[PDB]
Amino acid sequence: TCPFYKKIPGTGFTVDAFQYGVVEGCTAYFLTHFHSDHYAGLSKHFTFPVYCSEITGNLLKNKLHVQEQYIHPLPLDTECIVNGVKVVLLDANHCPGAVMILFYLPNGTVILHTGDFRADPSMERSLLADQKVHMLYLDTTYCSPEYTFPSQQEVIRFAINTAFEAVTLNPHALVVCGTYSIGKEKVFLAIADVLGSKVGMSQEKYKTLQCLNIPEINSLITTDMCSSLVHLLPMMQINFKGLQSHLKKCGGKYNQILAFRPTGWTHSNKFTRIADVIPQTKGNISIYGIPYSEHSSYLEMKRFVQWLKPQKIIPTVNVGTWKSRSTMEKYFREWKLEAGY
Ligand code: NI
Numbered sequence: 001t002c003p004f005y006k007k008i009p010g011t012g013f014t015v016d017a018f019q020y021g022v023v024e025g026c027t028a029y030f031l032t033h034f035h036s037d038h039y040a041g042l043s044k045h046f047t048f049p050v051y052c053s054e055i056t057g058n059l060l061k062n063k064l065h066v067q068e069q070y071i072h073p074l075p076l077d078t079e080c081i082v083n084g085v086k087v088v089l090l091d092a093n094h095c096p097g098a099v100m101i102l103f104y105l106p107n108g109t110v111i112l113h114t115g116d117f118r119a120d121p122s123m124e125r126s127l128l129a130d131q132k133v134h135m136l137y138l139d140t141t142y143c144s145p146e147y148t149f150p151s152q153q154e155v156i157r158f159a160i161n162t163a164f165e166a167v168t169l170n171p172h173a174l175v176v177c178g179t180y181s182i183g184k185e186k187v188f189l190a191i192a193d194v195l196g197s198k199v200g201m202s203q204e205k206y207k208t209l210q211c212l213n214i215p216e217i218n219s220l221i222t223t224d225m226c227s228s229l230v231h232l233l234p235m236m237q238i239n240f241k242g243l244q245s246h247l248k249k250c251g252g253k254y255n256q257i258l259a260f261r262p263t264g265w266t267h268s269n270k271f272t273r274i275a276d277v278i279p280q281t282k283g284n285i286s287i288y289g290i291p292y293s294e295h296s297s298y299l300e301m302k303r304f305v306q307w308l309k310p311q312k313i314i315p316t317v318n319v320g321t322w323k324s325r326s327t328m329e330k331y332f333r334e335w336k337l338e339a340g341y
Contacts, residue, residue, distance in 0.1 A: 002020045002023045003319075005315070009105075009111075010105040010106065011105065013082075014028075014030065015032060018031070018038075018040060018042050018046075019040040029048055030113075031050055032056075032099055032116065033095055033097055033099065034056050034060075035182070043065070046070060048070065053099050054073045054075070054097070055097025059208070062207065063208060063211070076091060077089075077126070085103060085104065085106065087102065087104070088101070088102040089102075092116065093120050093122075094118060094294045095116075098116060101113045102128070109134050110132060111133070112133045114139045118294055119296040119303065121303070133308055135311065136312070136314070137314045137316055141295040141318070142264075142301070143298065143301060143317075143318065143328050144298060144327070144331075145298045146298070147298045148299070149269055149291045149293050150291060155274060155292045158290065159187060159260060159288075159290060163194065164195065172254050174253075175191055175195070175260070176230075176232075176246065177191065177199075177230065177231070178232075178233060178260065179234070180236075184262045184292055185209070187262050187290070192230040193220070198221055198224075198230075199230045200221075200225040201231070201232040203223055206223050238287065239287075240282045240287075243285050243287075244285065257285045259285070260290055261287060261288065262290050265293065302335055305332075305335055306339040
């Protein structure tokens with residue numbers, strides 16, 4: 001049945017709650033972003049109002065064929081009224097089109113649902129600064145102090161410099177980047193830009209990228225693989241077998257692959273600095289695991305919450321085990337006692 005942490009009290013609203021059939025008494029279904037664990041259940045047969053960003057609405061229409069009449073896109077940073085309740089969508093710093101939702105309940109309670117987010121100090125100067133939040137529905141993906149990672153900027157610097165060096169040494173090397181969803185577009189786009197190439201990809205993936213309002217996208221991507229030296233493939237194919245196979249298909253145009261796997265976290269982060277990352281190599285194939293995250297680190301998450309000072313926190317991730325739930329609640333109490341709220 002629909003879990004409580006997907007329901008917004010004092011409203012008929014749900015968030016990311018499309019796989020439970022008709023939720024009893026739900027008058028509006030919000031969708032924070034276009035990732036499959038969140039949209040699971042939407043299709044052309046869905047006939048209730050869906051509220052979301054413009055970008056998420058482009059993907060619902062074009063990829064899942066949801067009918068236009070049930071898609072209600074809202075502008076960001078704008079007070080809007082939905083079934084008589086004031087709401088604001090804020091940028092979540094996750095994947096394209098991802099939002100956080102502020103609900104202003106008729107009784108005076110203010111609720112923030114972060115969706116999936118990567119907390120950033122820039123959030124401390126949005127419309128969140130203007131009033132108090134009483135309840136926070138928090139993306140707790142990496143809510144443990146072992147989860148450190150570098151900035152997105154530092155990781156893209158590493159990737160650009162690595163790719164540029166490799167291809168300048170060997171003009172017959174191919175760069176490959178893995179993907180399984182929207183998000184992390186900067187990895188492949190920044191590499192193509194330094195190399196003076198477009199990124200080549202499947203028709204399905206080109207379609208998905210054309211829904212994202214990215215500036216000058218027609219200039220950066222293509223379905224012509226032949227004219228491209230940066231290729232995008234499914235994440236599953238980023239292994240020695242899948243890469244050897246792909247290299248066969250390029251018909252002796254290339255004699256080396258440098259591949260990137262943008263993971264979330266991997267335990268090499270406890271020890272390894274970004275400067276110190278090395279690939280796994282077999283023959284003329286090298287694979288780099290790079291820690292490009294679109295979720296908060298532990299310290300980023302802690303800073304955001306100690307700034308916001310919510311009265312109650314409801315985790316939305318890692319809620320299925322007692323040991324995880326109990327450990328998170330202990331961090332929340334620490335943060336509150338350290339900060340004095
Ligand atoms: Ni997500």
